[PDB]
């Protein structure tokens, strides 16, 4: 809210009272933190472009995706990405230990909606479901590169007090298409982190109701591990409680 | 053509808004105008530049206090012919007498500098 | 992958040649010393480092002018005692070998010393003892490739531009003393031809002319030259007599009082010699 | 705070005339200088600067040097620095300079002819003997203190002519610099660095020629031969207002100075003499 | 609307008379000035022709040349 | 009166400290000297004789003070301490001294209410009156400026005072808590921190 000062000669008892609304300096403080955020979470994107780049593979993200051929190419990508966001949340692990299985699924009767990247054990050792039809339909649905998303005082305080700047084939639609591919994929390594740590009959329980990554997973995230991507924002379903009552 | 018009009381004077230029033909006539515009001094432009923009070939002093100058310019399709220019501007070479510019150009500057008050 | 296909990026370079020092031995890791200037995008193409431990000698700034032009030049860093091959601020093709140990260096110096000054037996010899030498297919090859072409770029960027520079009219300089009646200027023009396109590019970089004559005007910087050039090529020598003394005050009461804030004159010893002539700016 | 700005002992005895004196701070500066940096500047065109010789770790040895303000164009007149006492009355617009400076001038080059010419004259001023008196007394007590001072004669080796290679012969620098007054010879010596130093047989060069001139004419910023050095130099406007808000600059500068560089000093058995 | 110049001129300087007619002893401005003249009901605010915005280093005055042509 | 007595020692003490500045010969004033980057020596000057000079008055029978100092002028947040400007650390024997120059010409260039405020002053019309018929400098601004930088340097010196005489962990945890010194006076006279008071209060 606000504070007071008061400035006072020890011998004298002439006192000057002057008054600061904190405002101000919480406006500091979320641009603050807003500009942190953001820059963390550019730089974990470029860095996961950078090191897809490095992998060296010729055609774009997309285009790997719809070439159903080369599974080797969409294998080593889903793998390139789930060894990346589990260094991110365990930074001295560079490597994944146990071999990994790939599959690349190619039907509806085949993919599980709601889940297009997917574990299973045979038994000796983990195997990857992909539904690359589906991370194609969502790499494909067009964006909006125009429309902006979002207290109207603070607004217009960070309106008027920061400010603006006026040979990549990177455009905000190809780093949109990296976006969501992480996020899918931590997603999916989510699933995976509980499967391994609480038995394949937990991970069906979280399949069936992820609420349970709450506790599965906080208790080790939250303490020790950078933030869920989507931390970022607080995501929310338009007119859910409609919706939920339909 | 399109890219410019004729500055009314001149047959061989015209500017191109685009360029932002007036350009005072040196030898040659203006034909077929069915437009012309009003001479104005906003027409010219005061060029901005931390330093002085540097100019080549014969330049002419117009007016010191408004930083006002004509640079010969030949079209590289060879038309002779004369800008004016104002704007923070310096010449490579000596500046030059008007008085040097033949009578044609000199009419037509006359007629746009000096306000028919 | 990211980038456009192929689509050279743009970015900043390092330019001194002596960056690119490696071990061979690649089990035994080496950074090579560079100073940051390296990284300016100017004439010179040797760090500050560099020229100071190989060449004795300190980059510095002569303001010309209305239009402030600020004409390159280095500076002696070689004391009033030093004589001998101690004198010579950079070596001549015919004893840079000697002047540079380069026993007590390191094999990629001595071939990048090989690829300046043109000697291309030298730089043969070290090609192929390093291809009998050590593990060369397996990384030792492709780091004396890299190195290589490195140097090489560097000179190709170089030579061309030295050459246009050399047969051109516009501009002309004449590295001599230009006190004609002297002895210890000598065939300067001639030594300097003898020397390398990339070097020759170096002693325009660092020697300033006695004299600047631009268009009509003529600037002397200098009623005298503070060095020379023979056959053992540039030295740190006086033509006329005695060494000029310098105190090196740094690198390798009642005065005070009287003296506080104070212009004070540097004892800096810069490179002074030959002639050189322009037409209109050119800058 | 002993001022001895010397030329700010100027009183506008004049009552229409205030005399501003804007001279520079270091007159209060207890060196071997008698003229601070203003002054130099102004009728000498020389400005002041320092030399360091040894400076490593406490032997400081500071030579004293002024440079040149002199271009590369100016000549005779405009070129001669300190005019001697046969010239400085052409050289300096003595006419156009405030009658106690030009009694300055005639004592520092011995004028007394000019002296009482100018007491005669202010002998016929409006307020002569109220206060006019009392300024030529003030002013002429402090010049004459200050040339008494500077005079080593009142109650060394350093040679100016003494380096000229190419000269036919003769040298007699040094003996006008002998005819110049202790206060000029001493404004020389503090402002003059000599080319060569030599101590105890051990000879330091600064510079491979001298820069300075010395002749009946004066000092002269000329140099021994060629053409001359190269020596280059709120109220809100329509123009201040600058555009849109949008090349050695990573190395440092050498001064495009002419230091005044001319002479040889000897030392002999001493050794680095800071007292 | 082309020479900007002069309007960022006359608009300091009357800002300046104002600040020292408020404060007699400055006759300058200190931090230099940043100034923008908009073109557009989608970039000028109404009821303020005359505002201020810093760029976080340094204050820029934002001019609405058409409200002030048209009240003129 | 009285008050107005130790009024005039305060006021001579900051004209000591203006005598130091003096003799160090600023051509530009503070404020401009700490916006100006490239004036790292002038800076590191500045401080080390503001340090100096509170240490001769803090120890008056002491002259001694460190002749050799290394510093720092730090530009980046993540180089700089909310409440500590200036820092005193040590890189295993060599004593570092640290500056936030941003936060120096952030607190310079900050408007003072000078003339906003009104306070209480020898005022007598009869004599304004009486006077009337009978009938280089500082500004106030300069003045609270000159007072900032040299009371910001008290506070550094005082942790720099803690760590010479107690150690780097005791400076350590003086910068985490500076209820050592509520009590100060207890030398400490001589320092313009004790003179006065200043107090937050929730609001
Ligand atoms: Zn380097």
């Known amino acids: 809210n606000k504070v007071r000062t008061v400035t006072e000669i020890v011998n004298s008892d002439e006192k000057i009272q002057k008054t600061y609304e904190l405002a101000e300096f919480d406006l500091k403080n979320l641009s603050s933190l807003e500009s942190y955020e953001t820059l963390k979470i550019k730089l974990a994107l470029s860095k996961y472009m950078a090191m897809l780049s490095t992998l060296e593979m010729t055609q774009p993200l997309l285009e790997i995706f719809r070439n159903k051929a080369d599974t080797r190419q969409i294998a080593a990508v889903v793998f390139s990405t789930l060894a990346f966001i589990h260094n991110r949340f365990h930074p001295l692990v560079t490597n994944f230990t146990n071999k990994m299985e790939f599959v690349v699924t190619e039907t509806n009767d085949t993919s599980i909606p709601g889940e297009p990247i997917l574990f299973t054990e045979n038994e000796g050792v983990l195997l990857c479901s992909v539904d690359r039809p589906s991370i194609v339909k969502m790499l494909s649905r067009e964006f909006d590169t125009e429309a902006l998303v979002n207290n109207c005082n603070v607004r217009i305080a960070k309106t008027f007090g920061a400010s603006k700047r006026k040979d990549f084939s990177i455009t905000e639609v190809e780093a949109t298409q990296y976006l969501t591919l992480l996020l899918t994929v931590e997603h999916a390594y989510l699933h995976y982190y509980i499967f391994k740590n609480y038995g394949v009959f937990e991970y069906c329980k979280s399949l069936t109701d992820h609420s349970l990554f709450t506790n599965k997973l906080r208790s080790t995230m939250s303490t020790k591990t950078s933030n869920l991507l989507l931390s970022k924002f607080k995501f929310t379903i338009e007119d859910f409680d409609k919706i939920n009552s339909n | 053509s399109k890219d410019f018009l004729q500055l009314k009381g001149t047959m061989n004077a015209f500017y191109a808004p685009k360029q932002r230029i007036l350009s005072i033909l040196a030898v040659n006539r203006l034909f077929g105008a069915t437009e012309t515009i009003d001479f104005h001094p906003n027409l010219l432009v005061y060029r901005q530049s931390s330093p002085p923009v540097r100019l080549t070939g014969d330049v002419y002093v117009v007016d010191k206090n408004e930083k006002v100058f004509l640079v010969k310019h030949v079209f590289s399709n060879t038309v002779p012919a004369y800008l004016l220019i104002r704007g923070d501007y310096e010449s490579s070479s000596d500046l030059k007498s008007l008085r040097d510019l033949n009578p044609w150009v000199q009419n037509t500057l006359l007629k746009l500098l000096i306000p028919d008050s | ?283």
């Not at chain 3, 010579?88 to 840079?96: E, G, K, R, V």
């Open chain 3, 1 to 283: 992958l990211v980038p456009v296909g192929m689509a050279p990026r743009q970015m900043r370079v390092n330019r001194c040649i002596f960056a690119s020092i490696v071990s061979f031995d690649a089990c035994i890791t080496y950074k090579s010393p560079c100073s940051p200037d390296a990284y300016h995008d100017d004439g010179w193409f040797i760090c500050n480092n560099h020229l100071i431990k190989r060449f004795k000698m300190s980059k510095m700034v002569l303001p010309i002018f209305d239009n402030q032009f600020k004409m390159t030049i280095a500076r002696h860093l070689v004391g009033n005692k030093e004589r001998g091959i101690k004198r010579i601020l950079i070596p001549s093709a015919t004893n840079y070998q000697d002047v540079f140990n380069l026993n007590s260096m390191m094999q990629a110096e001595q071939l990048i010393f090989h690829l300046i000054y043109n000697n291309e037996n030298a730089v043969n010899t070290i090609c192929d003892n390093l291809k009998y030498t050590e593990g060369f297919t397996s990384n030792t090859q492709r780091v004396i490739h890299s190195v290589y072409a490195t140097t090489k770029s560097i000179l190709d960027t170089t030579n061309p531009n030295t050459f246009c520079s050399r047969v051109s009219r516009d501009e002309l300089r004449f590295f001599d003393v230009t006190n004609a009646r002297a002895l210890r200027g000598g065939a300067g023009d001639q030594l300097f031809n003898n020397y390398s396109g990339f070097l020759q590019n170096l002693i325009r970089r660092a020697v300033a002319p006695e004299y600047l004559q631009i268009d009509t005007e003529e600037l002397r910087f200098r009623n005298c030259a503070t060095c020379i050039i023979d056959e053992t090529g540039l030295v740190a020598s006086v033509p006329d007599g005695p060494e000029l003394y310098n105190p090196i005050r740094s690198s390798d009461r009642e005065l005070d009082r009287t003296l506080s804030g104070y212009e004070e004159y540097p004892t800096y010893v810069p490179l002074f010699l030959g002639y050189q002539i322009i037409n209109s700016e050119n800058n």
